[PDB]
Amino acid sequence: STLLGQLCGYYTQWSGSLEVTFMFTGSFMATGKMLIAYTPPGGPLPKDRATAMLGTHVIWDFGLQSSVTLVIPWISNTHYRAHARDGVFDYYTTGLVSIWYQTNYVVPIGAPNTAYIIALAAAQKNFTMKLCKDASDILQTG
Amino acid sequence: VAQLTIGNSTITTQEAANIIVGYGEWPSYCSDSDATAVDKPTRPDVSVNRFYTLDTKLWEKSSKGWYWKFPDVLTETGVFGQNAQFHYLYRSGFCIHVQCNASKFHQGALLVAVLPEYVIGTVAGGTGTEDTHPPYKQTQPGADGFELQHPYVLDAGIPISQLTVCPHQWINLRTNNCATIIVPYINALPFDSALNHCNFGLLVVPISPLDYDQGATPVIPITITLAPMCSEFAGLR
Amino acid sequence: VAQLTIGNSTITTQEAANIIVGYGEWPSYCSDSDATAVDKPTRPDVSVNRFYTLDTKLWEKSSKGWYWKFPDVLTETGVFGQNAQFHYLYRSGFCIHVQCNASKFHQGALLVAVLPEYVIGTVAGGTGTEDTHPPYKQTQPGADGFELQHPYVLDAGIPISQLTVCPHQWINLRTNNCATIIVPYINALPFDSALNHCNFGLLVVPISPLDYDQGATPVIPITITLAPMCSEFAGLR
Amino acid sequence: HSTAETTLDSFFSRAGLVGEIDLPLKGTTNPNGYANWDIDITGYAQMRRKVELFTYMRFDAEFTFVACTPTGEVVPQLLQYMFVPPGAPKPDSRESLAWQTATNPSVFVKLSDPPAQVSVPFMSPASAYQWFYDGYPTKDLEYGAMPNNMMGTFSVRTVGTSKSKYPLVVRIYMRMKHVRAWIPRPMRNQNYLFKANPNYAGNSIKPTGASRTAITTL
């Protein structure tokens, strides 16, 4: 969905630090804490909140700040793969981003008991891409 | 908080939130060594350039989103719609201001961006075999605007998820309520038609739906106020 | 408002409310001319010293109060619980941070104090003739903590009405929500056991009961985040 | 204008009675004409609560011995008071060789001679006596046991190979001196049940102080 994603598609390789920003769009009266943790490539999704609490994490109190930005130190689509019979320069660096309810959602009478959040991503200035590769499902029809 | 005035128009607005000067350029004029240096293009300052406050649209839970076209929106409105019509060419910059009025008990998030050459694409029959071209009420809605019917693809086959690539600003009810945007004249030509070509279109869509508990006002008024910057015209008729 | 970071831990907290440096002393290290100057005690800085955010406890109208033991609470938790266990001696200072998240429509007051050598005393049978010693789940509750059963005497035969004599701080919902406390190493010896002796215990009790009208969230999350200061260890196993 | 009386030393001075030995002739009590008294400063009732105001303490004790017959009479009998430091073995009998171990200070005095009096230092191998210990020594019955708070034992007995001719009663007073205290704490508001732990009666939980009818009546 991100523009970054769509552009990666016209290229074969790439690497750089990413950056996701979360936006709480709930009522102004709501408060609470969310734990956002990143498990580098290889590390399996943390069992629970506490184990994720030991990893690179960030406690987010949307009672204080409505936004928060997380940086993904590094991702590198460089490890080649020749599966079926079609060679694909794939990730493996599937870094993971988990998000747990550190505390529950707290609200006063009069405020909706649900709120949404929006993820926004982009890459740092250290991003790069290699190997033009035109590929698409959408093409000019006859 | 304080109130600014431009002639006979006086709006009550917040001190100076973050403004978004689209593409880093300021709506400026056009020098003498151009295409029409003879028909010296008269630049309106008096009444023509002031605060117009369009018919407020009401945000709802089910609202899909709205959009207006430029300069279409004003070619109907007042003494500016006066110039746009009885004049041959036009170039103008814009200051757009969008504000909501909601209690700290409402929630929502409106993305507000401007998109050059916003070309509407209808459904095309449904199955994809009808070459139906968007009407005139859909291509140039006026000052009432028009509602999207397929926000996700912005009624034109493009992800909205990527609209941020355009001069945009967010309006998250739990943080701000007013968003402001400065737009320069953008077109492949110095001047152009004010009634045939809509250089751009103002987009405002609910990304996070409006919400509230029963009892709170169910509709949030969105008020668009806008003002022309360094507007020029040529060839009276 | 702003967010501070210690390694991979990033907490969103208020600018700098009044902190309580217990007994006017700052958690410092221990010089070379001590008891064990040979087995040079390694002092963790890297990951060992950062922000741990314990399983949030939910405040209720009926809540009696909670308490954790130190260093017990962490000897289970992460890479710090790593050192505390496979090491012979320990000395460490603490930064404790307690916060609630409640609407301006909730009311309450939590006294939050730290008490050295907090020795639990059970009921003793009831009539006073059973010499029952508090269990291990009551003496060292871990990171979940434990609930008082006789707050008035702090489950130990002492008036709570006098707990203020200890490093304390108040959390009155209608004024603040976060309380912070700096604790130095306090013990009759330079170093000691991290698994056998609990130098102190964190106490947090509702002095004025939680209250609200039907419809407002009925439980107020209390979040304890804490960080080790000038922590030292000696004799690996 | 002066506040000398509100000092720690002022508060804890005074030699209080902390011990009383009975050495009857015919009796169930101390049948071997001797007795061993492990030093307990709680011996003075009022004491426990006063010291338990602080977490840590340090001090020296001055002991004064008062001996007479039950009617408070004085008689020509000689006595041996032996102090066995902690770690030293107490006498199991009236002829245990401990009575003669030089490393156990002993002092002799006749009942006629005025009170015996000696000072005992801060024993504890720790930096301070600590009234509260939240742990165990490397559900248990060893909880709150800071042993390194032992001051020692006082062994008393009539001098001589044979039982004394008179029924005797020794009283031990103790003045605390050179006191230093740390970390103050809530004043015990509930009744004590045991000499070891802070356990209280969970049924008989009484309000710190006198109650009244309404908060508007005096």
CB contact under 8 A, A120 and B164: yes
Q: Which of C117, C129, C152 to mutate to test the interface with D (most CBs of D within 10 A)?
A: C117
CB nearest A102 (choices: C56, C77, C215): C56
The b/e string for C171-197 (b: 16+ C-beta within 10 A; e otherwise) is: bebeeebbbbbbbbbbbbbbbbbbbeb
- CA C123, C126, C129, C130: dihedral to nearest 10 degrees? -60
CA–CA min distance A97, chain C (Å): 14
- DSSP state at residue A106: B
| Coil, strand or helix at C80 | helix
Is C134 in contact with D189 (Cβ distance < 8 A)? Answer: no
Distance between CA atoms of C22 and C114, rounded to whole angstroms?
Answer: 8
Give the H/E segment covering residue D8: helix D8-12
Q: How many angstroms separate the CA of residue A118 from the nearest CA in chain C?
A: 19
Q: Based on C-alpha coordinates, what's the Rg of chain B?
A: 19
Task: Tell me which residue range forms the domain holding B223.
Answer: 1-237
At D1, the amino acid letter reads H
Cβ-Cβ contacts under 8 Å, B207 against chain A: 25, 118
**CB-based contact B233:B42 (threshold 8 Å):** yes
Count up the domains in chain B and report the number.
Answer: 1
Using CB atoms, pick whichever of A23, A27, A120 lies closest to residue B106.
A27
Of the candidates C66, C101, C231, C182, which has an alpha carbon nearest to the alpha carbon of residue A59?
C101
Instruction: Find, among C12, C62, C17, C1, the residue nearest to C220 by Cα.
Output: C62
For chains B and D, tell me whether 3 or more CB atom pairs sit within 8 A of each other.
no
Q: What chain A residue is nearest to C219 in terms of C-alpha separation? A: A106
Which residues in chain C touch residue A56, judged by CB atoms under 8 angstroms apart? 8
The answer, yes or no, to whether C and A have at least 3 beta-carbon pairs within 8 Å is: yes
Q: Is D125 helix (H, G, I), strand (E, B) or coil?
A: coil
Does a cis peptide bond (omega within 30 degrees of 0) precede residue C71? yes
- Quick one: CA dihedral B213, B216, B219, B225, positive or negative? negative
Contact B162 A118 (CB under 8 A): no
Other residues' Cβ atoms within 10 Å of the Cβ of residue D216: 6
**Chain Cα centroid distance, residue D106:** 18
Dihedral angle computed from the Cα positions of residues C211, C215, C218 and C224, in that order, rounded to the nearest 10 degrees = -90
Strands C19-21 and C178-183: parallel
Task: Note whether A112 contacts B209, CB cutoff 8 Å.
Answer: no
Residue with tokens 């006859």: A142
| CA-only gyration radius of chain A, Å | 19
Question: For residues C210 and C61, what is the distance between their CA atoms, to the nearest angstrom?
Answer: 5
Q: What is the rounded CA–CA span in Å between residue D157 and residue D100?
A: 13
The answer to whether the CB of B202 falls within 8 A of the CB of B222 is no
Residue A129 parent element (H or E): strand A128-132
Q: In A, which residues are within 8 Å of C103 by CB distance?
A: 29, 31, 106-108, 111
For residue A25, which residues of chain B lie inside 8 Å, CB to CB? 107-109, 172-174, 207-208
End-to-end CA distance of chain D: 32
Using DSSP, state whether B51 is helix, strand or coil: coil
Q: Which residues contact C137 (CB under 8 A, 6 or more apart)?
A: C146
Give the nearest chain C residue to A67 (CA atoms).
C12
| Measured distance CA(A22)–CA(A121) in Å, rounded | 9
Angle subtended at Cα B154 by Cα B153 and Cα B155, rounded to the nearest 5 degrees: 90
- Mapping DSSP onto H, E and C, the string for B72-128 reads HHHCCCHHHHHHHHCEEEEEEEEEEEEEECCCCCCEEEEEEEEEECCCCCCCCCCCC
Cβ-Cβ contacts under 8 Å, B162 against chain A: 1-3, 6
Report the sign of the C-alpha dihedral through residues B2, B4, B9, B14, in that order. Answer: negative
* Residue C231 CA, distance from chain mean position: 16
Instruction: Report the 10 Å Cβ neighbour count for B125.
Output: 10
Q: Are C101 and A102 a contacting pair at CB < 8 A?
A: no
Joined together, the tokens standing for residue D214 give: 């309404």
List the resolution, Å: 4.9
- Paired tokens of C95: 């930064």
**Which residue in chain C has the smallest CA separation from A28?**
C103
Closest partner residue to A26 among B107, B170, B207, by Cβ? B107
What CATH number did the domain enclosing B2 receive?
Answer: 2.60.120.20
Q: Cα separation of D201 and C130, whole Å? A: 10
Contact residues of B toward A, CB < 8 A: 104-109, 159, 161-162, 164-165, 170, 172-175, 207-209, 211-213, 215-216
Find, among B95, B191, B84, B74, the residue nearest to B140 by Cα. Answer: B74
Residue from A62, A67, A55 nearest A119 by CA: A67
C residues 181-200 closer than 8 Å to D (CB): 186, 188-189, 193, 196-200
Which of B26, A22, A110 is CA-nearest to residue C215?
A110
> Is C216 in contact with A108 (Cβ distance < 8 A)?
yes
Which SS3 state, helix, strand or coil, does residue D31 take?
coil
From residue B151, give the alpha-carbon distance in Å to each of B111, B140, B159: 12, 18, 9
Residue D135 DSSP label = B
Put simply, the answer to whether C121 touches D189 (Cβ < 8 Å) is no
Place of tokens 């001098």: D159
Contacts of C188 in chain D (CB under 8 A): 56, 126-128, 130
In the chain, the amino acid numbered D52 is E
Which residue precedes each gap in chain A (C to N above 2.5 Å)?
none
Closest residue, chain C, to A69 (C-alpha): C10
A 1-30 residues inside an 8 A Cβ radius of C: 29
Contacts of A28 (CB under 8 A, 6+ apart): B104, B105, B107, B173, B174, B175
Query: What number of residues does chain B have?
Result: 237
- End-to-end C-alpha distance for chain A, whole angstroms: 27
Are the C-beta atoms of C180 and C39 separated by less than 8 Å?
A: no
Q: Are C77 and A64 in contact (CB < 8 Å)?
A: no
As a whole number of angstroms, the distance between CA A123 and CA B3 comes to 40
